[PDB]
Design a binder for this molecule. Structure first.
Ligand SMILES: Nc1ncnc2c1ncn2[C@@H]1O[C@H](COP(=O)(O)OP(=O)(O)OP(=O)(O)O)[C@@H](O)[C@H]1O
Ligand SMILES: CC(C)C[C@@H]1NC(=O)[C@H](C)N(C)C(=O)CNC(=O)/C(=C\c2ccccc2)N(C)C1=O
Ligand SMILES: Nc1ncnc2c1ncn2[C@@H]1O[C@H](COP(=O)(O)OP(=O)(O)O)[C@@H](O)[C@H]1O
Lengths: 51, 479, 501, 72, 245
């Protein structure tokens, strides 16, 4: 019973850390997607202005 | 009056040459008399977006440009886009430019207003931070609305968006001089006609005597050209702000939704050959948002309040369209699929509804502490759903059983039998004023209504109706 | 108030005392209107910077003058400028008339009052872009500028002459910080100016109402340009606030300027430069955005003894979406500004008002301007608050039933309890040092955490009325004297005996 | 196939006919729908149609937008 | 930049002096050209900068070389924009340098000041022919253990430390002591923290890190090594914080 309680507690900690890592990964992913979309649009309008 | 020829067209944008000196100011209407497929005279309206020079201006077409050959007669009106205002707009469905599409008959009441008008001055604008009282108990308690404020929607389909719209409409138009200008940009036509005939059968549009209805409806259809779904929002806005300015009503505006307006702004600007902004929205994102939002305020005449849905691109609030929409929003009402699946309407989520009005020194210390304690009770129960409602059950604690019981009472009590759910699902409607919501949830919390069944508060109005429902169910218990 | 008897002679006062001048003025012809630009075919010897006036009232500024047309920029919606119509080069290069008459009056970006009270009488003229003070026109800061917040004025102080960026998310309390700072200056000769770029009109109207009702309009100016206003007015209005502040700064008077917010000026300049077709840089901002912010932010300083001990304190604001500090505008402003005050939205949403992030917040010249009394009382507060922020992490498993961790929980929850504050209720330095010292000694460890705020306001009012010596010692010595410590201890023990019994 | 019409315009066609073909399918379904008769239509795919229209736009020097798709 | 460069170039050329140069910060000198090239009408290069970027870099950096006539040692700050290290301007700055010492945001926010990223800091002079065998050996093993902890950091952050072997927690503990002993209080930044400045030698930094890596110090805690100078300051710190009970 003591080891199963310790296991439940360790899984609780892991769920907390995994939620927070999911949050920061979502943050950086939003930044990555927005920067990639902007980079595409800027290279496209730059090439259109070139020709 | 200046007769102009059509020089260039590239799709929905147009190049109208003009006489040398006289030239239309920017944002002026241009009627380009054209023809149909069989050549009968039809007109396509334009709006000057740019004064290009050399006696030539550019315009964007509110209608489709199939029927407009080069060198056609373009008549200027001299003033911006005009729409009718008054009682004629009430009860009808309108297009982008104010030609009604209900097919009952033409419009009347030759008063009108430009679609583009300045914001109320700094001196007129009211400082009193009022509350938009509503017949709904949860948006009176949990997420209060500001008078003149901006409220967002985020609930999807089957959670009760349109019934909440009609409930706000009925409550504002019964309790006060409520006028509801629903302006739907990006409104796909079948859902728009569904909305129209829902309004028809629910009694908010009266057909035997029209214009005594409570709603005025504008449609920005998908298949409409670029500038149309930009300007439908301003159409509904000026139709609402006439009601504000001259009848001093408490006007209720609906832009469902603001994302189609932002997208259509981007597409107009992308066809205009402008260099786009960061993610791809128009270079003028914030000013286009502002010149639509900061016309929706509260003056000393009256107060126009808007409740405008939002779509967030892949739930990314970091995107410019949501992060600029929230720069003008005040509250949010996130309807839940969870409270729809549980089966208690309205399907809002109290833990996810935010309001800037929920502060003590705005709406009272009593209302504040009541809302805070209710939030804490529901936040107990949401974590305790996994604890006891799945596995634990170890006679949880009497101080925790007291929370689970009254959290059941409060989740039942959050619902309310709507006025226009009567013919829909069989629920006779009740108005619950704000003070009655506060006192009812006060007594649900304070340890006075724990003994009654948890269903004595489900689908009920006030709290006295809840105790009376408890007595009637107990008469059925002794039966 | 009758006026018919005097109007019959002030109709004639306007005629007398008039020069009837003659002046050769430049004049062009407007060609293209669109995207906030007007190409003018005229203006042979126009100055790049002229206040070009338009025949339909709108004032403009001449930028892009190549060889066959001058591409001016419109200060406002150049809607009704009829094509071909004349312009007039006003001879002056982008100036602002300034005087003391603004003090109270709200003002546009173009110096035009929107108060509906009167006109502003200003014979003196300041350039909107005056050169920033160089290396000899400056002097390291030592006079404090207290914002009235315990946390700010405690562990991240603000000098008179130090930029402190109030960086934080949307609806995290930055406007509350700025208004608390302005309201705390009810006595001190800090002629505040609050410029509000691109905000909702109801917010600035409510803040104007607060500023008038709290007895604060006598020393503030509100430069207002809403989100309805054009991109150029919003882009310009911080420089208008800077000219208004530099007028009072050069005349030996301490001032305070609060841009709200610099991110909106960055969006306005992005729209401006993208409708100008300038190839933009880091996520579509123009490459000039760092210059845009620096050429106004480096005008805030402490002027020299030879210059007159004036000062300009800039409290800019930068909104951050998704909490990312790495984004372009905040990482630029941090490299420009001295320190930052981050306002953590997760604290604020948990219920910590104000939500000052205790760790990221920085002040370069903080401990210089922080007075001796606050220094001596706030060192130990900083030590204990830092250790509480560390001990709260992993608080459960390792350090659960220790003497030190139970004591430090009752002294690290309660420290945070005494940091929180009501909006628009500032504490002068006397109440600040007293309410810090009781948490430093630890005279609230036995109290219930729920009664702490009431206990603090009761202590504050008891030492207010029943102790007329502590205010005088803290004002005079500017050092937490042991005599003040004795009499304050007397007050603390008697107030504790009132409360616990 | 006793009732199914299958309009088709493969990849080797110009961008013009790929852009056109869904409108011909829609006109046929519109006609049969206006004969008081229930119909159906399958578009396969709208991505190829959008690529054809985007190419037709970019060849005509129409200003490109997000990921080169024009504003239409 | 060119003004300061010729003002040092004259000293180095004529007076034969060893000259120092401190530039702060050349990313602004890059952004100047990137701001003026958009006004000169020239076509924009990679995401925002000018096409002549690396030539702009070289036209400063190659003139900052030492000769047989004199010396120029040029400390410079190179502000990486938006906390991005692979932006074109730092990317083209990385080539004309003899040592890079990149300053992290994570080590700044976690408080180990200076916030030097240890194993992303590189110099061309860490070679056993210059610094001898012992110094390069100790430096190599320090970087090895730091990277071992850096590799384990994800598994640590998600779950923790108990799941590891003893031989893995030996390296995690050694690198947790090193990551704190890499701080050093500054003679300037004493006015911020309050800990007065400490100058530590190289010949004693090596011995401190040898005492750490040997294991003669691993018993005393990890916050003992935080913000000290010599190794005896850390050992006396451990002896001191066991007196105040
Ligand atoms: N210390 C405080 N005590 C009580 N209320 C506060 C405090 N700080 C902020 N608030 C409240 O939080 C709300 C938002 O704060 P504030 O307006 O300062 O942030 P903001 O960034 O200006 O928001 P926005 O930019 O959207 O206007 C306000 O209604 C304010 O009254
Ligand atoms: C805007 C006014 C009040 C000050 C300007 N000058 C400056 O702020 C500094 C000194 N700059 C940028 C210049 O030297 C060039 N001037 C301008 O760019 C401008 C204008 C400008 C237009 C569009 C984008 C950027 C700048 N000036 C005319 C100035 O005099
Ligand atoms: N008070 C209520 N009582 C019973 N059912 C309700 C109530 N309010 C809403 N509903 C249910 O919610 C549904 C409304 O969904 P709807 O708003 O049309 O979705 P959409 O957002 O796609 O328009 C109705 O079908 C109705 O069954």
């Amino acid at each position: 019973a003591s080891e199963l309680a310790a296991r439940m507690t360790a899984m609780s900690n892991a769920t907390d850390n995994a939620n927070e890592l999911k949050k920061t990964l979502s943050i950086n992913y939003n930044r990555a997607r927005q920067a990639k979309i902007t980079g595409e649009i800027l290279e496209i309008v730059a090439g259109a202005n070139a020709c | 009056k200046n007769l102009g020829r059509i020089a260039q067209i590239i799709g929905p944008v147009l190049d109208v040459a003009f006489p040398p000196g006289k030239m239309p100011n920017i944002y002026n209407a241009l009627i380009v008399k054209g023809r149909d497929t069989a050549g009968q005279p039809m007109n396509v309206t334009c709006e000057v977006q740019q004064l290009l020079g050399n006696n030539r201006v550019r315009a964007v077409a509110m209608s489709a440009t199939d029927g407009l050959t080069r060198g056609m007669e373009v008549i200027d009106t001299g003033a911006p886009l005009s729409v009718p205002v008054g009682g004629a707009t009430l009860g009808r469905i309108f297009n982008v430019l104010g030609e009604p599409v209900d097919n009952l008959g033409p419009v009347d009441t030759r008063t009108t207003s430009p679609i583009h008008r300045s914001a109320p001055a700094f001196t007129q604008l009211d400082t009193k931070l009022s509350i938009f009282e509503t017949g709904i108990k949860v948006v009176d308690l949990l997420a209060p609305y500001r008078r003149g404020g901006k409220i967002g929607l985020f609930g999807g389909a089957g959670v009760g968006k349109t019934v909440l719209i009609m409930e706000l409409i009925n409550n504002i138009a019964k309790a006060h001089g409520g006028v509801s200008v629903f302006g739907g940009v990006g409104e796909r036509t079948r859902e728009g006609n569904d909305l129209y005939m829902e309004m028809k059968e629910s009694g908010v549009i009266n057909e035997q005597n029209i214009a005594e209805s409570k709603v005025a409806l504008v449609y920005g259809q998908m298949n409409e050209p670029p500038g149309a779904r930009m300007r439908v929002g301003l159409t509904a806005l000026t139709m609402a702000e006439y009601f504000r300015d001259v009848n001093e009503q408490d006007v209720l505006l609906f832009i469902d939704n603001i994302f189609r307006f932002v997208q259509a702004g981007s597409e107009v600007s992308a066809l205009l050959g402008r260099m786009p902004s960061a993610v791809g929205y128009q270079p003028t994102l914030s000013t286009e948002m502002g010149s639509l939002q900061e016309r929706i305020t509260s003056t000393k005449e009256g107060s126009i309040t808007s409740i405008q849905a939002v779509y967030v691109p892949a739930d990314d609030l970091t995107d410019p369209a949501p992060a600029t929409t929230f720069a003008h929003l005040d509250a949010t009402t996130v309807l839940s699929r969870g409270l729809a699946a549980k089966g208690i309407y309205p399907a809002v989520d109290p833990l996810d509804s935010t309001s800037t009005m929920l502060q003590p020194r705005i709406v009272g210390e009593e209302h504040y502490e009541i809302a805070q304690r209710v939030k804490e009770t529901l936040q107990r129960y949401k974590e305790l759903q996994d604890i006891i409602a799945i596995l634990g059950l170890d006679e949880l604690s009497e101080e925790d059983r007291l929370t689970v019981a009254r959290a059941r009472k409060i989740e039942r009590f959050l619902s309310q039998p709507f006025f226009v759910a009567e013919v829909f699902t069989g629920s006779p409607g009740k108005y619950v004023g704000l003070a009655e919501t506060i006192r009812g949830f006060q007594l649900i919390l304070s340890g006075e209504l724990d003994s009654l069944p948890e269903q004595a508060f489900y689908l009920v109005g006030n709290i006295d109706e809840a105790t009376a429902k408890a007595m009637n169910l107990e008469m059925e218990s002794k039966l | 108030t009758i006026r018919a008897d005097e109007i019959s002679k002030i109709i004639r006062e306007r005629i007398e005392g008039y020069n009837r001048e003659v002046k050769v003025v430049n004049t062009g012809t407007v060609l293209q209107v669109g995207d906030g630009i007007a190409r003018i075919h005229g203006l042979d010897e126009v100055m790049a910077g002229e206040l070009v006036e338009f025949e339909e009232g709108t004032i403009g500024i001449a930028l892009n003058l190549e060889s066959n047309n001058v591409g001016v920029v419109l200060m406002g919606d150049g809607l009704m400028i009829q094509e071909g119509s004349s312009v007039k080069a006003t001879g002056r290069i982008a100036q602002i008339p300034v005087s003391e008459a603004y003090l109270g009056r709200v003002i546009n970006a173009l110096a035009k009052p929107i108060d509906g009270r009167g006109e502003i009488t200003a014979s003196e003229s300041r350039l909107i872009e005056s050169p920033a003070p160089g290396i000899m026109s400056r002097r390291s800061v030592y006079e404090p500028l207290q914002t009235g917040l315990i946390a700010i004025d405690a562990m991240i102080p603000v000098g008179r002459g130090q930029r402190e960026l109030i960086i934080g998310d949307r609806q995290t309390g930055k406007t509350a910080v700025a208004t608390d700072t302005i309201l705390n200056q009810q006595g001190q000769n800090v002629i505040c100016v609050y410029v509000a770029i691109g905000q909702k009109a109801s917010s600035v109207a409510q803040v104007v109402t607060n500023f008038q009702e709290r007895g604060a309009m006598e020393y503030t100016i509100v430069v207002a340009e809403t989100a309805d206003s054009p991109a150029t007015l919003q882009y310009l209005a911080p420089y208008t606030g800077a000219a208004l502040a530099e007028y009072f700064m050069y005349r030996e008077r301490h001032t305070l300027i609060i841009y709200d917010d610099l991110s909106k000026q960055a969006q306005a300049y992005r729209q401006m430069s993208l409708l100008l077709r300038r190839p933009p840089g880091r996520e579509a901002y123009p490459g000039d955005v760092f210059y845009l912010h620096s050429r106004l932010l480096e005008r805030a300083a402490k002027l020299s003894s030879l210059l007159g001990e004036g000062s300009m304190t800039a409290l800019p604001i930068v909104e951050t979406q998704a909490g990312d500090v790495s984004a372009y505008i905040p990482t630029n402003v941090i490299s420009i500004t001295d320190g930052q005050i981050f306002l953590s939205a997760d604290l604020f949403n948990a219920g910590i008002r104000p939500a000052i992030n205790v760790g990221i917040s920085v002040s370069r010249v903080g401990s210089a301007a922080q007075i001796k009394a606050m220094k001596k009382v706030a060192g130990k507060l900083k030590l204990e608050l830092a250790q509480f922020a560390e001990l709260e992490a992993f608080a459960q498993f390792a350090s659960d039933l220790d003497k030190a961790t139970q004591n430090q929980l009752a002294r690290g929850q309660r420290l945070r309890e005494l940091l929180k504050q009501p909006q628009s209720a500032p504490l002068t330095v006397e109440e600040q040092v007293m309410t810090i010292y009781t948490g430093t000694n630890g005279y609230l460890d036995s109290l219930e955490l729920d009664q702490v705020r009431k206990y603090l306001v009761e202590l504050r009012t008891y030492v207010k009325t029943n102790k007329p010596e502590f205010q005088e010692i803290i004002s005079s010595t500017k050092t937490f004297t042991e005599e003040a410590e004795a009499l304050l201890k007397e007050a603390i023990q008697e107030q504790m005996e009132r409360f616990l019994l």
